[PDB]
From Swiss-Prot, chains A, B:
GO terms for biological process: fatty acid biosynthetic process; long-chain fatty acid biosynthetic process; malonyl-CoA biosynthetic process. It comes from the Bacteria. One of its GO terms (molecular function) is ATP binding. Its main location: cytoplasm. It comes from Escherichia coli (strain K12). Keywords: ATP-binding, Cytoplasm, Fatty acid biosynthesis, Fatty acid metabolism, Lipid biosynthesis, Lipid metabolism, Nucleotide-binding, Transferase. This is Acetyl-coenzyme A carboxylase carboxyl transferase subunit alpha.
Length: 316, 316
């Protein structure tokens, strides 16, 4: 299901599908499929550049929410192996809006923590649209401590609309849990790398994003507040979300100059959704490179550097 | 237009035709034409043997009258070159039921006399269904004399239902003209070869068929009277034509044993009409072979042999 501005790409795709049927549909129909396929694929490839060259911040947000995209499960599958999912906070529940586990990266063992919006409606409602109740963040703290204890690096993916705004979420110390998370992660003796795949932000995202390095795709928005919220509070409306997106600076290159993120991982054309494997390979390369130049530093120097980088936050 | 017993061959042909259309008809239709063409041609080739193995004398007559077949024009075109058509009896008209001319056979010059039924209805009525009025036979005598004079061999084809049974034909000495023809041809000083391509007989055919050699296709009937006439006079009916054909002995092999014809030229499968070129090549080879072993004999010995062979006619 392509977005509104990806229409010319769609109709060309719509002609492309029935090519399979015409191959063996009925009445002996087996036409010269290869010629038409090649011409239509050429046109489609040419047109996507005609479509994805002129997208800006409001679009970037739409693309960051494309309802066909790799979630943390997808990146785990397409760049990680021997994945073991640990579920359980030890207190009140395991949460489906966060998925964590311990896996191997090119032999090396790692910890993977991140969100999972679910693909279709069913897995979206079963995972609460990637909105974690605090018990999830307590689980994430528990896993992060486990990873710290056994001299293990931590790889974290961040793809959350935000911490759930609900009765159950507020009752259980949402603020307290996120505060603790932000406290412990800033003392681990192991390197930390955190991407911004997909749509993330709204503070709750930061619960698992305080690390040595930070990386973001080219169509991923990292906003202290969703554009619609900023629009409602400030613009006194919702339709004016694109203006809020333009003003805030939620796009990766805008953030990059702000010394906030350490690298942008380029996407396959038309969005990572068109070539999830290519995006997974790019992410794996970026993660490995980040880990490499990180392992040289010792644990004490690692923590000191982490603290120093934090203090660089804010123009002050 | 195939005959009644060639139906299974037809329907398979009927499926075969629209293969051309399906190649580029509409809606991008270009199917794997070669596979279906090969399979259907295999089936058609197998079926014709299933159809032309079990034909007998009544059929042979039907095949001899297949309304798709090479007439003398066709054999001239497909086995002769530098053909010049002489038309004119010098007396009252040139006739379209006979076509004569002087042409070359592999360099050698020859004379070609024979009938031409015309292909479609128009050329059939314009040529009087290959039925010659006597002026035609006078023309044939004139040409035969011309060929004799200039030491030239004569090749004759014979494809006639018969001499026209009409007022104009009877008035002009039909009997006289044919008698003269039968007289002169038995004195020419040049070799004579005469086939029985197509349907011929009824005496008038003999007007141009008294030569050193005689040859007949495998599906050509040479009857002193059409089967239908024999049926009407003797059987007292018309439907009983096949019995008349069986009794008379109008089929080539039946005649061959009678010492009446000197050779049968085998046909392409399914009738010469399916491969007119192959039939033309076979006819040309037979004609050349006949001429070869004939030119050895001198003119006097040629005429003496011709006379002796004639006397062998009839068991007496």
């Amino acid at each position: 299901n392509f977005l509104d501005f990806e229409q010319p790409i769609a109709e060309l795709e719509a002609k492309i599908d029935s090519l399979t049927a015409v191959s063996r549909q009925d009445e002996k129909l087996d036409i010269n499929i290869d010629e038409e396929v090649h011409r239509l694929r050429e046109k489609s490839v040419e047109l996507t550049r005609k479509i994805f060259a002129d997208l800006g911040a409001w679009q970037i947000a739409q693309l960051a929410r494309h309802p066909q995209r790799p979630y943390t499960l997808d990146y785990v599958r397409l760049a990680f192996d021997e994945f073991d999912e640990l579920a359980g906070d030890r207190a009140y529940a395991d949460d489906k809006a966060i998925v964590g586990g311990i896996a191997r990266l090119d032999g090396r063992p790692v910890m993977i923590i991140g969100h999972q919006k679910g693909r279709e409606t069913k897995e979206k409602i079963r995972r609460n649209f990637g909105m974690p109740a605090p018990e999830g963040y307590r689980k994430a703290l528990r896993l992060m401590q486990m990873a710290e204890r056994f001299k293990m690096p931590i790889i974290t993916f961040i793809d959350t609309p935000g911490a759930y705004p609900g009765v159950g979420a507020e009752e259980r110390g949402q603020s307290e849990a996120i505060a603790r998370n932000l406290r412990e992660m800033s003392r681990l003796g192991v390197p930390v790398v955190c991407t911004v795949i997909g749509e993330g932000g709204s503070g709750g995202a930061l619960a698992i994003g305080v690390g040595d390095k930070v990386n973001m795709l080219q169509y991923s928005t990292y906003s202290v507040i969703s554009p619609e919220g900023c629009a409602s509070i400030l613009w006194k409306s919702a339709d004016k979300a694109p203006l809020a997106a333009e003003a805030m600076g939620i796009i990766a290159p805008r953030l990059k100059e702000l010394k906030l993120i350490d690298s942008i991982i380029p996407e396959p054309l038309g969005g990572a959704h068109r070539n999830p494997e290519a995006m997974a390979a790019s992410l794996k390369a970026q993660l490995l490179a980040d880990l490499a130049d990180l392992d040289v530093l010792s644990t004490e120097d690692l923590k000191n550097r982490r603290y120093q980088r934090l203090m660089s936050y804010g123009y002050a």
